[PDB]
Every structure is written in structure tokens, then in C-alpha cells.
Design a protein around this ligand. Structure first.
Ligand SMILES: Cc1cc2nc3c(=O)[nH]c(=O)nc-3n(C[C@H](O)[C@H](O)[C@H](O)COP(=O)(O)OP(=O)(O)OC[C@H]3O[C@@H](n4cnc5c(N)ncnc54)[C@H](O)[C@@H]3O)c2cc1C
Ligand SMILES: NC(=O)C1=CN([C@@H]2O[C@H](COP(=O)(O)OP(=O)(O)OC[C@H]3O[C@@H](n4cnc5c(N)ncnc54)[C@H](O)[C@@H]3O)[C@@H](O)[C@H]2O)C=CC1
Ligand SMILES: Nc1nc2c(c(=O)[nH]1)N[C@H]1C(S)=C(S)[C@@H](COP(=O)(O)O)O[C@H]1N2
Ligand SMILES: O=C(O)c1ccccc1O
Ligand code: MOS
Ligand code: MOS
Ligand code: FES
Ligand code: FES
Ligand SMILES: [Ca+2]
Lengths: 1289, 99, 50
């Protein structure tokens, strides 16, 4: 094998044993020790693994820089390429690059797991364009995800490259002259003639062909050889599709596969040309050539806009997408409809043929022969009287799989409207790209008119049929899109041939609007010391290190020379008996160490919050993903492969998947929960109107950028074990590990530095991985670790609880509520976990901010064969609040009154009691309400929304303003306790330790701010290193948004103890320094170490007597959002959001606004974009960012404004502040109801005339539900055009 | 610990002070983030001075557990500990001695 | 202490000490040391940050 030679951050790397299967990410992290680059999904979607690649382009005779996903880039494609990671551009040890500095100072980093990847995308842009426009900056992140920030801070800080939270004036100017030089050695190796290289790995042989002749010989010589260019498809096949290609040929170097020729018929691109090049070349052609000649080009470009991100487009080859021939390819429909020419060659043979319906004979296949390879693709110039359109619709605009995508071309007779040629090619309607030949054939010689339109739609409705079990589901939506797409095409061609003003917008291609961001908060007292940072926008203390990639996350911790890897073995059945396990083939995998099961457990196999779970499945599995055992091996790949071949024999059992199956089978956990106040009977009797209905709200995957991870170190003495875990509950991790091992708790030490996101997903379910790794450590005596891949995490760890509600509300014509009844049902999963408390918080919030005199709420936990669901930011509150706002919205419509009016009149007032009889003191919703109305200019915009709806037939705008209140405190009284430990060393430096953990919310930053203020010393003298069970024991999980409140108090008390001890010395030496008082105290033998403790007073609610305080106080807020839906596709824009939040006297406005935006965006995702799909048998389909869509940079409100309520000190918490972690999440629902408002405008447009109609809209309001709800001539036709002999009169 | 059995003696002391078996007590290591500004282990006074520190810390624990011990006289050490925890009484404390 | 497992990337340090009871250090030549397999670096007073 030849040597693989490339560079990393200027340093030359010579790999003599390069394995074709090794990815750059694995190499950087496990071989080069550069852990700044992270694993977030492994499938090109999160961008957390983003790096920059540089190389001398021989054909261009220039050095080119471009981003790329390390997780998908085979190091074998990098021969003579220069890699640049986040560590190569700057660090806190040296100097931060402007990119790293700005994202950190702008509060663009919270948990920080995504920061390096985002930094590299921005950096790569700057290396291509030193002074980019706002648009270029925004597009640089099509392929980067962030779960914590809400994206606003990141974009606002980065736009600077084109009181306040930050000051751009302090930002260091970008200076290209000071950027790292291209490796001088590589520039010399360019004069050297390229040579064929060969790399040999454990299972794969890789051949880097240098010439076309070589490639053709290789293909002839080895027909089975798999070609690879960008590997963005093959990596997925090998990684997720369990594929193995013994031989691989990379033709990336060949000149012919990279040439770009401008001919008379069109533009020719070599098959290896990256999509970013095709996109750049085509954009150029469109700018210079007549519009009439670039119809197809513009079609290609429109698809490329929403085609993955910069990372993928920079390596993804044109030929690769074509040959992969996926049914939902966005390019093939366009190439087919246009007759794009393909030059196919083999040793000897050669031919150029237009692409047509026959090029794809079957699923993921093409007409190419085994020895043939796609040489080039020529995209045609459009001719006169020839028009083209390309459309795509998915769940999210950015980087997503098309539900339906297409290419549409029409050629008329010279200067006429008479069809000579018509091609409608679709993706997402078959197991391949298809052309509706039967439909279009009937229109040849016909004229472009209404009749043709009706005919085509009827034709499509009948020819493009979908069985009810069609892969991808969403049958109705898809068929509707095929017709809506043609309609858009029909109108666009009419326009082009030259149209009602109210139809015009339907022909417009997506146009992003100019962003606008404003944050408002209160300045601190004029006489406040510069060293007292309480109330100031101090950046997250680890933000600079997060931006540089120096911040250490669990897997970044180096491995011991003898550290092994664990891979969980899980059930592939929702409910079945385990008849036997066969590890015979696993034992054959190199590096196999052992297979662990329940019988290996020395202590107890009974785990879980309520001891209703197994550590390892025993005789029976109760959900797909149920952990049966685990394989330990010498490397991650080896453990994965062995685990994959472990054969489990099951015997299925009756399963209960859905909430419906549960209710009918009486499958519940415990008994019914209920809160009832007043007289329902007398309530409904006094009601003028009564609305009854059913409402559903889907689940949610936390999607913390850092998945579950645990490192367990077995000491070998007295059962001692030290674990490094990504968890919010060091206490339970410790007790559960000990219970499993069967040793005292004092033997187990759990350490938590930070989490790349938790969101409740790491409050209990982190133990599923921890206890298993601990067992492996115990059994092997070796240290063991395991970080979950995204698909494992999504499948096993549980998520937010899906809710089903059955409500009945009674109200007067005035809109006043007089009676309410709601039965909540949650899908809890295969164990109790936190389901019961979640239902409780749900019931505590079924009132939101409205006084309902007669009320009854109930809840039931559905016992099902699904991974156990757990805590998720909101903890049941969001579901209950959503249900409440749903019936409130129906009340407004029914009474024919303005929603804001109905909400306001029903709203609580100072001193009122909730349904659970707790007095509302300091009820600030009215203030947030009025300021939000005013600052958002609600009324004025209200009239402008109506106007827009009158001038637009296929696009509507909606506007909604909703309030929220969130009870602060664990509803389990004993959890409201916090401890802290403080040490003042002799140099005067302080080390603070407390029970809370850091997950990006800035808990430590705030604790240092507090300690600094309490002790009256600069924050520079204080430090918080980690959370550990041997410093602060019996800690509650970091949750319920009360960490700042309670640890703040514990830290405060410990500080007070310190001050009392130093007082004597302060009096003896008044002009002395803190250092002098500390040293004198030490000399005098006075202890400089103390614990601190807080216990939230007066808490204890009973559901039995409906009495006692349930919360310490409530955090309030109001959000007003406006949207614009596309009645024909389901897509929509979040035009503007205005938020007013009451967080009392913020301890840190920067972090608190960050929390508001982050929560808001997470709620936005819950109510409008995120959806998990399960097979009827209970098997999750959506196991990655590719199919599960969380908010992207482009998903946030274009105009995003946040204000923290002024002068609202909360005497109930540390320094008059308020919890902010979860309270704002529900406000994201404002976007949901704005959308429903827009949908009602659409229905009143094409559906019916019942101004008081009450159509059901469940969450999430995805493009599917939005489009399906916009009933029109097309949706209708998709049913009737898909009858009975007789029909009763 | 360097072989003189300081930890053993400290466990013996904790056991007697708290009035529970030594089997329920453990000492894993010495670290600067648990006990700061320590004098070097020398002058033969370790048992003396740490013996007192540990003793005092044990006293604080007994006083915190006293109320629960009274409400449930026949309960076990585990019973009083869990009850104290659920009543939100801290089970952590420092101990200090000055010759 | 030494029974504690070594990290996969853990290096080893060997002290370089004086062979004289009292003398001026005129020069230090690591040229031959640098040639030893596995050599990483030679640390001296000038490398101390504090
Ligand atoms: C995050 C992400 C987002 C994506 N977004 C989209 C999207 O929006 N729309 C869409 O359609 N696709 C999308 N893709 C799919 C993928 O990026 C494309 O199919 C890509 O263009 C394939 O190129 P590649 O060079 O990476 O292929 P590889 O993975 O290297 O090869 C792909 C297949 O093509 C064959 N092949 C490659 N070159 C040749 C040749 N010259 N002759 C014969 N056979 C050849 C290979 O043998 C293999 O079967 C996405 C992928 C990821 C990971
Ligand atoms: N990873 C990402 O973020 C993205 C990936 N992609 C592309 O998506 C591809 C998805 O591949 P897979 O997961 O294997 O799914 P796939 O390649 O099998 O495509 C599934 C889709 O094809 C259609 N389909 C297939 N069989 C059908 C049938 N019998 N009847 C009706 N319709 C049928 C449906 O629309 C279904 O959703 C990837 O290989 C990639 O090329 C596209 C966009 C984003
Ligand atoms: N960046 C980031 N912010 C976050 C989270 C997170 O995991 N990452 N967790 C949320 C959740 S579910 C909770 S309960 C609170 C917990 O921390 P706190 O009590 O200090 O506010 O932070 C919220 N904000
Ligand atoms: O929010 C709560 O009330 C709660 C109660 C118990 C455990 C975790 C929690 O978040
Ligand atoms: O109380 Mo947060 O972890 S859902
Ligand atoms: O006081 Mo002992 O270490 S000579
Ligand atoms: S780890 Fe590479 S894109 Fe997510
Ligand atoms: S800061 Fe981006 S995912 Fe946490
Ligand atoms: Ca559960």
C-alpha cells in the first residue's frame, strides 16, 4: 500500500497504513488527538464535524478552500489536501480568531457542542470572501444545527463581518494577511505528475485512479468495484445500511470527471464536479446569458438552494446524486424533464443519451452497466417557447428529504400557446423518479388554458396513485403537492408567456426577507460596582473555550491505553419473548472481548426511578430499543460490528403501541390523577355555548448536540468506580450504578464537567448507558466508555410525552369561560420514570393564565411498548398549555370575537387563586401583555394581515398573541434542596462547588456571578470546575428550572459563612487586601472551607385536598408571532416574533435572553417542525437529523424581538431573579396559532363560508397538516379522482 | 495514608462517634478539592488533629439526625438518614480542629 | 501511583541532573538525545511559563 500524505493545521501527516474505512473525524479524534471536531449525527446533517479543506486545483491553477463534514470524509480522499480544524485557527491559550471571538462575545454559544462546526463554516466563508454579505453569511449555515441558542445571537454576531448585550466595537478586525499559509510543501507537490495510489484496510481496498484510462481499466478489471467521490452516499450505506464494498475506486482526480465545457447545446460538467461548482457555474451562466436560454439552469439552481448545506454540496458530486437514483432525488426529476444529456463510457464503448423515464428501471438502479461509469452531464440551454419549473417541498426548507419534488418542462409551437412537448417528472411518488407520460401525452397539440389545467390535474390525480402503505406515508399531502406543483407551473408559464393580482404570488420563488433583531433589558443601578456582575450581560464563562474547541465534553476525555468500548444490543421487537441469544458470529469479529447480559450483573438487574425496569432485558423485551445486552471490543467499529451480528430469537407477544391501544386495553400506570374545583354541572348549565373536541400533540426528541456518553473507571479496590458522565443527575447515576453493582453508594464517584445539551433528556435516561458501561468495567476490570450514535440515542432514550386530550368547555357569548373539562392521556412508554410528575405539572397548567370558576382535569399514563418517555424542557407543561390555548382559540372563533379580547377578559388578576387554590402574587402577565401589544404594534399589523389576505389567494398571513405562566419548583417537595461547597485557598483564589450541572444554560457562570457579589471580590478570583458526588452529595437532578434559585442560595450562604470567618481579620487590617485577610485567617488556623445549603420554604401540595403551595412563584411572559403560509405547499415563513418575559431582576440578561430565545425556538420546533414517525408495529422511522427536523438557522422569526420586563424584582429568589429555563418554551405556540389563524383565512377563501367553523389542527403544524387543512379544488380532486352503485336519498 | 494506618483509625473514630459499624464508613483518598489548605501529613499528629476534625463533623451529623431519631426511636440508621434527606436536611458537613 | 493505568497518549519524563557539586552551566547539547527513538522534547528553565 502507498502512503497517504496530507496536512492538518499546517502539520504534515504521513499515514502508512491508511484504512479506506477511516473517516477524517475518527482520524482527527482518535489518532491526532484533535478533539475540537465533534460527532453529532454522523450523517451530514448537524455540521458539528465541520472542517475546512484546502487544496491546489490543477484545472483552475489556484488554491481553493471549502467546508466539509469530517464524519463523512474518508481520509483516503484527502491525499495532498490541507485540513483546518477549529484548533488550527485560534485558541484561548494563544489568541482567538475573530470568528471564535465574536460568536463567544455575542452569546452565540451555550452548551457549545455545535460551536466548533459553526465556527468553521463561518471561517471557511471568510476564507473565500473576506467581506461577505448578510445573505452569504446566512447561507453558510444551511448545514449546521444548534439546539441551545435560537440561532439569533450567532447570526447577529456574525453579521458584523459584513443597554446592549455585546459591543461590536471591541471586536478585532479580520485580517487575511495573518491567516495560516497553504502548506509550502503541497504547493511543490503540484508540479509532480499524479499517480495511482492503493490503500489497504481491514476489509477494504481503495484505488485512487489518476487517469480516465486507469479508471476504465479498473472498472473492466473489477466490475464489482464501488466508485466513490464525495462518499456522502456510500458512507451512509456502510454506516447505516450495513453495506460492505471490498473494493473502492475513487476517480475524483481524473481531469475529464472535473472538466466544465460550454458548448452550443448547453453546459457540460464532469461527473465528479461538486454540486457547489455546478451551482457556481450555473449562477454565472444565468447572470450573463439571456433569461430565455437559462430556464433549465434556473430550475437546477432552485433545487440546489434547498439541497443540503455547504459542507455536503462542496464534496457531493453531480454524478453521485444521479447514479444513487434515490426516489426523492431533487436533481433527477429536473434532469429527466429537461432531457439532460449523459455521457456514459467504459473501456472502448462510449455514448451520450438524453435522460428519460427509462433511465431508472427500478429502485435505486439505473441503465448503467457494471463496467460503465458516468463521464459527464450536459445541462441544456432552454429554447424559445420553452419554459421550465422545479419545485420541492419537505418538512423543513433547509437540508431535508423531499416529500415531493419535480422538474417540469413545456415546449410550445413557435410563438404559440399550443403544447408541442410536455414533461412532468416527479420524485417522491414512486420507488424511482417517474414521468407522468400518460397525463402529458394527452395534452400534446392542446392549448395552455383552464381546460388543460383541469385535465392535467385530473390526469395526475389518477395516474400518480399511492397505496395506503406507500413508503414515506403522507399519501394525501403528496398527491396534493403533485397537483399544486403543476398548478404553480401552469400559472408561471401563463405569466411567462406574457394574471389576476391575487394569483401572482403563487408564481413567486421563495424570497428571504431582511432580518431584524432587537433585545431590550434593564441596566443595573448607576452606582453598582464594576466588579459586581449581577445584572450584567456577562458572557458564558466557557464560551471562548467552546468556540476554540478546548472545552472538554465526556468523549473528549482521552482514553486509557487499556480502555475498551461498549455497544448496546437492543430489541428489534416491540414485545416478545427472548428465546435465545447466539453470539457465535460476534465472537468472530476482530477485537471482540465479550458479550454481557443480565446474568453478568453481580448486584441487581432491577433499575429505574420506580424499580420497574431491567438493566438488561430478562426473558422478555418490551419495546424496540429495549436493551438486551452489550458487546465490549477493542475499538468502536469492532464493538458495533460484533453487536450487529448478535442473533436474538424472539416469539412475539400482543403489543400495545398507541395511546388508543392503551385506553381500549386499559393499559395504564397507576390510577387517574385529577384536580376539580367548582361545580361543573352548574357551570355548563349557565353556559350559552359549549364546545367539545379532541386534540393531539406529538412527541419530541431532545436532540442535544452531544448524545448520551459515559466513561467508567474501575479502580479494583473495594468495588470503587469513578465515572465521567454526560448527565443532569449525578446522584441517581451514582445510586443506580451502585445498586447494579451491589455495593455501598460511598464506593461510586460520578463526575460531571459539562453536557453538550440535556433538556431533561439526561435527567434519568442517562443511566441506561451509565449502568451498562459500569457493568462492563466491573466485569472486564478495564476502563470502558460508550457514546451513543444519534440513531441509538433517538431510539432508546425516550423523549417528550405525546399527549391526547378530550375537552369540553362552556362559555358565554361574551367569551367568558364558565366551565371546563379535560381528560389528558400521555404515552408513557415501557416504564414509569418521570411520567407521573409530568402529568401532574400538566394538570397544574391546564389553566394557563385564565380564571375558570368550574373546572375538572384528569390524566392517565398509558403503559405501552415504546421506549419510556421522560422529562423534556417543559415537563408536561407545554402539552397542557397547548390544549388550553386550543379551546381558548375555539371559544374566540365561536363567539365571533377578537382572540386577544377573549383571552384578556378571561385572564387572571392579581390575588386570584388558580384551580389548585394557590394565590397569584406578583401576577405580571397584564404588564407583559400590554407592553407586547404595544411594542409589537399588534393592532396595526392586525389590519395589515387582513389586507394581505384580501390581496392574496394562495398565500395567507396569520397573527396571534398568547400568554403563559409556569410554576417554579419541583412538584416533589423533597427535591427542592440544594448544597454547595466552597474552598478559599491560601493564594486567595476560590473554588466553588455545588450540586447543579452545566448543560449550556450558564448555571456555573451565574453561580460565579453570585459568589463574586456575595464575597465582594472579582469573578476572576472564583472558579467552578465540575460537579461531583464527593464534593456535594444527595443532589437533586439539575432540572425544573430552579438550579439558579436553589444553588444560588446555597452558594450565597456558604459565602456568608466565609465572610463571617474573615471578619475579625478584616477589622484588624482594614486597609488590607482580600489576599491579606485570607492568609491571616489561614495563619490563625481558621477554616477556609464551608458548605452552603438551601431549602425552598412552604411547599407541599395535595391533589387529594387540593391545598398547599405547589410552587414558590410563577414566571410569566407573552409572545406575539406573525407568519405567512403557502396554501399550495404547506411551507411558511416566521415573519416576526415579539416576546416580553418576566424573569424578575435578571442575574444575567444575556444568558436569560439566550434562554428565552432558545426555549422559544425549541417550542417552535415542537409545534411546527418536529415529528417522530413510528411503524404500526412500533418501530421508529425517524432516527437522524435527515428525517427528524429541528429548527434550522432559517427557521427563526426573521424579525425577532425579546424584552425582559423592567422593574419586577422577585423577592422569592436569589437577588430578586426568576427561573427562566423552561417557562418560555410554550411561547413558541404563538407561531402555531398564528398558522391556524392563517389557515382559517385560507379555508374561508377556498373551503367554505362558515366564519365560525372549528376545524381540528393537531401539533405539530407541519407542512403536511398545513397543506391538508387548506382544502381547495386540488385536495378535493385528490380524493374524488383517486362512484357507488346506489346511495340512500 | 503512607502505611501508618491513618485512614483505618479515622474510620474507627467515625464509627465510634456516629455509633455505627465501620462497614458503613469509607475513606477513598485525600484530595485538595474536598479538604483545602491541609498541613502535610507529619509530626505524628495526624490521628490527633484529623481525629478531632472527623469527630466534630460526626457530631454535626448526629445533631441533624437527632429530630428524626426521636420521632422514630426504634428505627434504623438507614431509616433516620432517608427521613432526614426527605425532610431536606443536609447530610454533608465539614469538621475542623485547632490544637 | 504508577499502578494507575496510563492514558493512550501519556508520555514519560526523565530528569536530567548535574554531575557536578558546584559549577556554571556553560551549554547544553541535546543533538544526540533528539536522535533517540520516541524522543519528544527537552525541557529546561526557559520553558517555565510562571
Ligand atoms: C446531509 C445530506 C444532505 C443531502 N441532501 C440532498 C438533497 O437535498 N437532494 C438530493 O437529491 N440528494 C441529497 N443528498 C444526497 C447526496 O449528497 C447526493 O446523492 C450526492 O450528490 C452523491 O454524491 P457523492 O459524490 O457524495 O457520492 P458517493 O457517495 O461517492 O457515490 C454515490 C453512488 O454514485 C456512484 N457513482 C459516483 N460517481 C459515479 C460515476 N462517475 N459513474 C458511475 N457511478 C458513480 C457510486 O458508485 C455510488 O453508488 C444528501 C446527503 C447528505 C449526507
Ligand atoms: N440525509 C439528508 O439530510 C438528506 C438525504 N437525502 C437523500 O435521501 C435519501 C434517502 O434514502 P432512504 O432513507 O434509503 O430512503 P429512499 O431512498 O428509499 O427514499 C424514500 C422515498 O422514496 C419514495 N418511495 C420509495 N418507494 C416507494 C414506493 N414503493 N411507493 C411510493 N413511494 C416510494 C417515498 O417518497 C419515500 O419517502 C438519501 O440516500 C439521500 O440521497 C435527501 C435530502 C436530505
Ligand atoms: N443550552 C442549554 N439550555 C438549557 C438546557 C440545556 O440542556 N442546554 N436545559 C433546559 C432545561 S430542560 C432546564 S429544567 C433548565 C435547567 O437548568 P436551570 O435550573 O439552571 O435553569 O435549563 C434549560 N435550558
Ligand atoms: O417539574 C417538576 O415538578 C419536577 C418534579 C420531579 C422531578 C423533576 C421535575 O422537573
Ligand atoms: O426540568 Mo428540565 O430537565 S425538562
Ligand atoms: O513528621 Mo514525619 O514526615 S519526619
Ligand atoms: S457529525 Fe458530521 S454532520 Fe453531524
Ligand atoms: S450551543 Fe449550539 S447546540 Fe448547544
Ligand atoms: Ca415513562
Amino acid at each position: 500500500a502507498d502512503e497517504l500524505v496530507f496536512f492538518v493545521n499546517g502539520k504534515k501527516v504521513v499515514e502508512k497504513n491508511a484504512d479506506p474505512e477511516t473517516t477524517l473525524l475518527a482520524y482527527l479524534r482518535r489518532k491526532l488527538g484533535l478533539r475540537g471536531t465533534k460527532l453529532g449525527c454522523g450523517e451530514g446533517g448537524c455540521g458539528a464535524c465541520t472542517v475546512m479543506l484546502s487544496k491546489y486545483d490543477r484545472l483552475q491553477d489556484k488554491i481553493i478552500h471549502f467546508s466539509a463534514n469530517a464524519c463523512l470524509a474518508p481520509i483516503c480522499t484527502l491525499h495532498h489536501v490541507a485540513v483546518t480544524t477549529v484548533e488550527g485557527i485560534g485558541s484561548t491559550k494563544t489568541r482567538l480568531h475573530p470568528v471564535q471571538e465574536r460568536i463567544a462575545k455575542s452569546h452565540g454559544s451555550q452548551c457549545g457542542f455545535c460551536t466548533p462546526g459553526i465556527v468553521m463554516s463561518m471561517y471557511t466563508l471568510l476564507r473565500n470572501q473576506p467581506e461577505p454579505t448578510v445573505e452569504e453569511i446566512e447561507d453558510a449555515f444551511q448545514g449546521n444545527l444548534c439546539r441551545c441558542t435560537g440561532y439569533r445571537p450567532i447570526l447577529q454576531g456574525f453579521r458584523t463581518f459584513a443597554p446592549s448585550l455585546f459591543n461590536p466595537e471591541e471586536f478585532m478586525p479580520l485580517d487575511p494577511t495573518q491567516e495560516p499559509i497553504f502548506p509550502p510543501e503541497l504547493l511543490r507537490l503540484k508540479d509532480v505528475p499524479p499517480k495511482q495510489l492503493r490503500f489497504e484496510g481491514e476489509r477494504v481496498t481503495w484505488i485512487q485512479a489518476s487517469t480516465l484510462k486507469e479508471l476504465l481499466d479498473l472498472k473492466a478489471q473489477h466490475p464489482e468495484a464501488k466508485l466513490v467521490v464525495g462518499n456522502t452516499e456510500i458512507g451512509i450505506e456502510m454506516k447505516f445500511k450495513n453495506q460492505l464494498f471490498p473494493m473502492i475506486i475513487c476517480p475524483a482526480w481524473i481531469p475529464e470527471l472535473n472538466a466544465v465545457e460550454h458548448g452550443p447545446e448547453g453546459i457540460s460538467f464532469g461527473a465528479a464536479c461538486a454540486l457547489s461548482s455546478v451551482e457556481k457555474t450555473l449562477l454565472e451562466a444565468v447572470a450573463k446569458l439571456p433569461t430565455q436560454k437559462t430556464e433549465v439552469f434556473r430550475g437546477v439552481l432552485e433545487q440546489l438552494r434547498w439541497f443540503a448545506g455547504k459542507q455536503v454540496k462542496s464534496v457531493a458530486s453531480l454524478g453521485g446524486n444521479i447514479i444513487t437514483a434515490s426516489p426523492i432525488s431533487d436533481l433527477n426529476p429536473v434532469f429527466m424533464a429537461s432531457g439532460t444529456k449523459l455521457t456514459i463510457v467504459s473501456r472502448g464503448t462510449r455514448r451520450t443519451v438524453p435522460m428519460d423515464h427509462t433511465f431508472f428501471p427500478s429502485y435505486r438502479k439505473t441503465l448503467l452497466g457494471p463496467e460503465e461509469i458516468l463521464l459527464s452531464i450536459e445541462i441544456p440551454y432552454s429554447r424559445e417557447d420553452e419554459f421550465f419549473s422545479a419545485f420541492k417541498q419537505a418538512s423543513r426548507r433547509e437540508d431535508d428529504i423531499a416529500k415531493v419534488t419535480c422538474g417540469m418542462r413545456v415546449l410550445f409551437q413557435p410563438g404559440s400557446m399550443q403544447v408541442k412537448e410536455l414533461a412532468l417528472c416527479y420524485g417522491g411518488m414512486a420507488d424511482r423518479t417517474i414521468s407522468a407520460l400518460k397525463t402529458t401525452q394527452k395534452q400534446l397539440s392542446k392549448f395552455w388554458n383552464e381546460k388543460l389545467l383541469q385535465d392535467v390535474c385530473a390526469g395526475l390525480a389518477e395516474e400518480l396513485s399511492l397505496s395506503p402503505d406507500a413508503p414515506g406515508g403522507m399519501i394525501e399531502f403528496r398527491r396534493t403537492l403533485t397537483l399544486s406543483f403543476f398548478f404553480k407551473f401552469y400559472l408561471t408559464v401563463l405569466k411567462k408567456l406574457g394574471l389576476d393580482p391575487t394569483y401572482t404570488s403563487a408564481t413567486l420563488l421563495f424570497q428571504k426577507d431582511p432580518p431584524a433583531n432587537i433585545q431590550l433589558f434593564q441596566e443595573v443601578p448607576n452606582g453598582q460596582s464594576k466588579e459586581d456582575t449581577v445584572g450584567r450581560p456577562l458572557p458564558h464563562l466557557a464560551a471562548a473555550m467552546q468556540a476554540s474547541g478546548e472545552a472538554v465534553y465526556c468523549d473528549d476525555i482521552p482514553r486509557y491505553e487499556n480502555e475498551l468500548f461498549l455497544r448496546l444490543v437492543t430489541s428489534t421487537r416491540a414485545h416478545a419473548k427472548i428465546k435465545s441469544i447466539d453470539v457465535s458470529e460476534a465472537q468472530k469479529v476482530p477485537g471482540f472481548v465479550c458479550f454481557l447480559s443480565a446474568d453478568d450483573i453481580p448486584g441487581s438487574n432491577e433499575t429505574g426511578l420506580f424499580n420497574d425496569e431491567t438493566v438488561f432485558a430478562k426473558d422478555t423485551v418490551t419495546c424496540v430499543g429495549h436493551i438486551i445486552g452489550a458487546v465490549v471490543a477493542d475499538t468502536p467499529e469492532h464493538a458495533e460490528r460484533a453487536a450487529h451480528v448478535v442473533k436474538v430469537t424472539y416469539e412475539d407477544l400482543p403489543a400495545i403501541i398507541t395511546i388508543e391501544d392503551a385506553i381500549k386495553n386499559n393499559s395504564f400506570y397507576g390510577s387517574e390523577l385529577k384536580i376539580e374545583k367548582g361545580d361543573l354541572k352548574k357551570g355548563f348549565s349557565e353556559a350559552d355555548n359549549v364546545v367539545s373536541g379532541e386534540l393531539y400533540i406529538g412527541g419530541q426528541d431532545h436532540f442535544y448536540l452531544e448524545t448520551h456518553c459515559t466513561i467508567a473507571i474501575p479502580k479494583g479496590e473495594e468495588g470503587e468506580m469513578e465515572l465521567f458522565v454526560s448527565t443532569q443527575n449525578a446522584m441517581k447515576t451514582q445510586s443506580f450504578v451502585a445498586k447494579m453493582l451491589g455495593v455501598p453508594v460511598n464506593r461510586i464517584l460520578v463526575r460531571v464537567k459539562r453536557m453538550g445539551g440535556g433538556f431533561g433528556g439526561k435527567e434519568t435516561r442517562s443511566t441506561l448507558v451509565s449502568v451498562a458501561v459500569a457493568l462492563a468495567a466491573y466485569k472486564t476490570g478495564h476502563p470502558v466508555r460508550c457514546m451513543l450514535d444519534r440513531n441509538e440515542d433517538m431510539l432508546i432514550t425516550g423523549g417528550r410525552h405525546p399527549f391526547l386530550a378530550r375537552y369540553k368547555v362552556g362559555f358565554m357569548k361574551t367569551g367568558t369561560i364558565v366551565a371546563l373539562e379535560v381528560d389528558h392521556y400521555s404515552n408513557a412508554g415501557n416504564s414509569r420514570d418521570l411520567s407521573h410528575s409530568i402529568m401532574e405539572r400538566a394538570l397544574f397548567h391546564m389553566d394557563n393564565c385564565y380564571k375558570i370558576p368550574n373546572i375538572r382535569g384528569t390524566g392517565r399514563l398509558c403503559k405501552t411498548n415504546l421506549s419510556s418517555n421522560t422529562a423534556f424542557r417543559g415537563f408536561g407543561g407545554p402539552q397542557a398549555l397547548f390544549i388550553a390555548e386550543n379551546w381558548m382559540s375555539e371559544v374566540a372563533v365561536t363567539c365571533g370575537l377578537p382572540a386577544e379580547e377573549v383571552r384578556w377578559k378571561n385572564m387572571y388578576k392579581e390575588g386570584d387563586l388558580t384551580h389548585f387554590n394557590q394565590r397569584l402574587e406578583g401576577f405580571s402577565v397584564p404588564r407583559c401583555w400590554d407592553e407586547c401589544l404595544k411594542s409589537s404594534q399588534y393592532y396595526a399589523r392586525k389590519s395589515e394581515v387582513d389586507k394581505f389576505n384580501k390581496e392574496n389567494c394562495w398565500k395567507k398571513r396569520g397573527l396571534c398573541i398568547i400568554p403563559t405562566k409556569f410554576g417554579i419548583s419541583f412538584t416533589v417537595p423533597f427535591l427542592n434542596q440544594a448544597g454547595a461547597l466552597i474552598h478559599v485557598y491560601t493564594d486567595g483564589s476560590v473554588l466553588v462547588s455545588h450540586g447543579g450541572t452545566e448543560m449550556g444554560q450558564g448555571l456555573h457562570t451565574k453561580m460565579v456571578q453570585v459568589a463574586s457579589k456575595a464575597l465582594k471580590i472579582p469573578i476572576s478570583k472564583i472558579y467552578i470546575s465540575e460537579t461531583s458526588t464527593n464534593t456535594v452529595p444527595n443532589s437533586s437532578p439539575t432540572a425544573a428550572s430552579v438550579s439558579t434559585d436553589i444553588y444560588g442560595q446555597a452558594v450565597y450562604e456558604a459565602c456568608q459563612t466565609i465572610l463571617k470567618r474573615l471578619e475579625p481579620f478584616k477589622k484588624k487590617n482594614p486597609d488590607g487586601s482580600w489576599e491579606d485577610w485570607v492568609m491571616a485567617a489561614y495563619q490563625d488556623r481558621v477554616s477556609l472551607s464551608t458548605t452552603g445549603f438551601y431549602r425552598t420554604p412552604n411547599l407541599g401540595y395535595s391533589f387529594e385536598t387540593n391545598s398547599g403551595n405547589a410552587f414558590h412563584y410563577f414566571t410569566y411572559g407573552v409572545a406575539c408571532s406573525e407568519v405567512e403560509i403557502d396554501c399550495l405547499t404547506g411551507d411558511h415563513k416566521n415573519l416576526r416574533t415579539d416576546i416580553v418575559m418576566d424573569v424578575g431582576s435578571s442575574l444575567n440578561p444575556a444568558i436569560d435572553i439566550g434562554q428565552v430565545e432558545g426555549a422559544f425556538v425549541q417550542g417552535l420546533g415542537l409545534f411546527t417542525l418536529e415529528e417522530l414517525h413510528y411503524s404500526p408495529e412500533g418501530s421508529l422511522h425517524t432516527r437522524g437529523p435527515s428525517t427528524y427536523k429541528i429548527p434550522a438557522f432559517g427557521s427563526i422569526p426573521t424579525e425577532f424581538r425579546v424584552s425582559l420586563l423592567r422593574d419586577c424584582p422577585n423577592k422569592k429568589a436569589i437577588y430578586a431573579s426568576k427561573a427562566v429555563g423552561e417557562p418560555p418554551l410554550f411561547l413558541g405556540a404563538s407561531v402555531f396559532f398564528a398558522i391556524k389563524d392563517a389557515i382559517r383565512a385560507a379555508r374561508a377563501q377556498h373551503t367554505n363560508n362558515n366564519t365560525k367553523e372549528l376545524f381540528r389542527l393537531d401539533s405539530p403544524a407541519t407542512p403536511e397538516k398545513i397543506r391538508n387543512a387548506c382544502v381547495d379544488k386540488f385536495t378535493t380532486l385528490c380524493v374524488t379522482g383517486a362512484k357507488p352503485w346506489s346511495l340512500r336519498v
